Amino acid sequence: ITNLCPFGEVFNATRFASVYAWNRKRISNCVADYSVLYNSASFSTFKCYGVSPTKLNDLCFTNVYADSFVIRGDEVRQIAPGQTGKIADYNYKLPDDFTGCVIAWNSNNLDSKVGGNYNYLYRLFRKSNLKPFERDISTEIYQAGSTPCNGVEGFNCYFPLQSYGFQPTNGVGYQPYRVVVLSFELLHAPATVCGPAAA
Amino acid sequence: AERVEQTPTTTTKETGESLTINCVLRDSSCALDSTYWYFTKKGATKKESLSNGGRYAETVNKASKSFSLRISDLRVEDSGTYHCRAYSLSAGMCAWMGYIEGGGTIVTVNS
Ligand SMILES: *[C@@H]1O[C@H](CO)[C@@H](O)[C@H](O)[C@H]1NC(C)=O
């Protein structure tokens, strides 16, 4: 079935994950019009690393993954190789050798309420940085000192997750952005994900 | 923090005045290779292409990675949100190819 990749299911999903609990959808055995995404005009960020966005329709890949989550506008810059900060270190980390596109759009109209949207969380604390594409959904109380923690919150013993408050009248830097990260894998196996214009 | 800084964030103008929006690709090693402007009317959600035509004039300084849209002889139909998109398509000093976009300018025109 040489039929269109279900990119609609990723980009137009009703629900998006919290960044700490970021979704990964495997895409295979389908034809993908990357140009319609790139030329869309809904997106505020579209950055392709190790591949030109205008040649995507001409390439085939072994596997495509679509990772998706919500962050604040001024965190979108952290979804890039080499970056540091709460998001890049403790929630979602790209490898230094990343091949793929980082795509984002303002989602203020979907992910802010009147009185503010409190449904989204991010990991604030961790013992070390995530490895590329690592996911940590643990709620173990974080031990910031020598003193053991025993699952109990105290003066150096922190709950590791905090809530985004998405206020609708805030500045764009504080607004929610939906993000999709496409990773392109080219291995020694049959290439199952192709543009319309590829062999 | 690699971003496009679009100023002003909001303006109110009288019909007949002109307005200038300035964008600069900040905190980037990336070249500015092309630009694009979009408008949504007041109370609409559709992002639509600007024409680069009679009332709308564009400036670009590629070295400084800055550009501007000037709209002359404003009307009330001009009221809405303007977005600038900055393209980097060379792949030298930039790790990436594609676009990043301003936060927008919310324009209100009275009469
Ligand atoms: C999601 O939004 C609308 C559906 O009515 C459509 O214009 C757009 O292509 C969709 N996005 C995709 C398929 O990536």
The full DSSP string for A4-41 is B--THHHHT-S---BGGG-EEEEE-SEE--HHHHHH-S
Residues A101, A139, single domain; the answer is no
Q: Are residues A9 and A83 in the same domain?
A: yes
Ligand 1 nearest-atom number relative to CA A40: 9
- By what method was this entry solved? X-ray
Nearest CA distance, B1 vs chain A (angstrom): 6
Indicate whether A10 and A61 sit together in one domain. Answer: yes
* A106 residue type, one letter: N
Contacts of B27 in chain A (CB under 8 A): 77
Q: How many domains does chain A have?
A: 2
Residue of B nearest to A98 (CA): B95
B101 inside 8 A of chain A by CB: yes
Is residue B89 within 8 A of residue B34, CB to CB? The reply is yes
Structure tokens at A172: 């764009």
Nearest chain A residue to B46, by CA: A42
State whether A137 and A80 are in the same domain. no
Collect all residues with Cβ–Cβ distance below 8 Å to B103 and sequence separation of at least 6: A73, A171, A172, A173, B4, B5, B6, B9
The DSSP secondary structure of A114-182, one letter per residue, reads TT-B---EEE---SSPPPTT------PPEE-SSS--TT--BTTEE-SEEE--B-TTS-GGGSEEEEEEE
Q: Do A60 and A111 belong to one domain? A: yes
Q: Do A173 and B9 touch (CB under 8 A)?
A: no
* Residue of B47, B91, B103 lying closest to A172 (CB–CB): B103
Domain span at A49: 1-115+168-199
Give A74→chain B minimum CA distance, Å: 8
Q: Per the CB < 8 Å rule, is B97 touching A52? A: yes
Asked if A94 and A101 touch (Cβ cutoff 8 Å), the reply is no
Q: Same structural domain for residues A2 and A29?
A: yes
Task: Say which DSSP state A113 is in.
Answer: -
Residues A70 and A162 in one domain: no
What is the four-CA torsion angle of A148, A154, A157, A158, rounded to 10 degrees? 160
Q: Residues A99, A131: one domain?
A: no
Q: Does B104 touch chain A (CB under 8 A)?
A: yes
Quick one: which atom of ligand 1 is closest to the CA of A12? Answer: 1
Q: What is the C-alpha to C-alpha distance for residues A180 and A127, in angstroms, rounded to an integer?
A: 27
Contact of B43 with chain A, judged by CB distance below 8 Å, is answered with no
Instruction: Please report residues of B whose CB lies closer than 8 A to that of A48.
Output: 96-98
Phi first, then psi: give them for residue A10, nearest 5 degrees. Answer: -85, -60
Show residues of chain A in contact with B100, CB under 8 Å. 44-47
Q: Which chain B residue's Cα is nearest to A54? A: B98
